[PDB]
Amino acid sequence: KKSFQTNVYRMSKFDTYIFNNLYINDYKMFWIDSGIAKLIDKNCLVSYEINSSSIILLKKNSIQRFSLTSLSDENINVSVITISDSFIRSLKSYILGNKDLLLWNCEHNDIAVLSEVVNGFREINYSDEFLKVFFSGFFSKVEKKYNSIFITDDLDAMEKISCLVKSDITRNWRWADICGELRTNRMILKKELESRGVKFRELINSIRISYSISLMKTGEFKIKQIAYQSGFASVSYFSTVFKSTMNVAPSEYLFMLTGV
Numbered sequence: 460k461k462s463f464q465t466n467v468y469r470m471s472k473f474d475t476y477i478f479n480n481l482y483i484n485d486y487k488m489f490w491i492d493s494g495i496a497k498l499i500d501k502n503c504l505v506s507y508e509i510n511s512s513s514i515i516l517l518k519k520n521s522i523q524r525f526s527l528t529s530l531s532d533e534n535i536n537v538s539v540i541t542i543s544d545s546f547i548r549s550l551k552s553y554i555l556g557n558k559d560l561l562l563w564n565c566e567h568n569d570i571a572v573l574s575e576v577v578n579g580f581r582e583i584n585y586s587d588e589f590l591k592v593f594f595s596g597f598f599s600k601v602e603k604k605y606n607s608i609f610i611t612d613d614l615d616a617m618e619k620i621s622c623l624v625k626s627d628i629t630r631n632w633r634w635a636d637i638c639g640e641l642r643t644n645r646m647i648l649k650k651e652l653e654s655r656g657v658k659f660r661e662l663i664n665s666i667r668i669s670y671s672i673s674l675m676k677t678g679e680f681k682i683k684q685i686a687y688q689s690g691f692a693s694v695s696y697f698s699t700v701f702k703s704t705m706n707v708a709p710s711e712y713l714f715m716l717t718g719v
């Protein structure tokens with residue numbers, strides 16, 4: 460359970476959630492509990508319908524640009540599972556021998572286990588062993604259904620940059636700071652941002668927004684405090700960037716962390 464952080468979001472009939480420059484702090488996976496939805500991937504310029512068996516995987520350190528639109532006349536619950544790095548590396552272990560958004564059409568076996576994870580393991584209490592072989596076997600499969608490895612040699616350049624920023628979120632980050640800390644020139648590091656279609660400012664802001672989300676999940680409701688705790692120079696800039704990224708206001712998202 461501590462290796463799994465889950466949330467459930469309500470989706471009104473035919474409503475749309477829009478994400479722009481959304482930085483994925485840790486591996487995530489989500490799916491709808493019922494009905495049908497339309498996912499539009501602005502990064503690959505593609506769209507497709509998903510059902511209660513479709514599982515979407517988001518790669519850590521990726522910068523997402525997509526929208527999800529309900530195509531159901533009833534409310535839909537979107538379950539989101541966040542996996543800890545400690546568990547992910549456990550998965551790397553059970554697996555021996557550039558796509559950031561992976562879609563997997565389940566065989567109501569995997570979506571059954573995933574549904575129990577969001578369900579807080581209160582109907583079935585899988586073991587560490589099973590969960591490790593399951594998930595490891597899950598990514599191992601989806602990796603084949605796509606371009607490259609979903610997991611990453613930990614010392615990836617983007618991972619180094621992200622961890623750096625997260626380790627001192629309020630520092631007034633500049634390219635010079637990144638190059639100096641990583642002992643690497645910008646000509647070599649710039650590919651990480653280019654391939655993700657973001658300029659330096661956007662990258663730092665994206666990491667700070669996801670950091671603010673993590674804070675709101677711990678039980679922090681004071682928006683004013685969250686703005687500064689997340690490294691933003693002001694509450695207004697935080698709110699502007701948050702709204703631009705999540706398409707909703709910070710306080711609005713916090714409210715969604717309640718659940719009905």
Ligand SMILES: CCCCCC/C=C\CCCCCCCC(=O)O
Pocket residue numbers: 466468476477489527537539672705706707712715
């Ligand atoms: C705008 C409110 C957020 C609604 C989130 C549910 C919709 C799609 C699932 C995508 C998950 C990425 C959102 C990040 C938030 C989180 O980490 O829980």
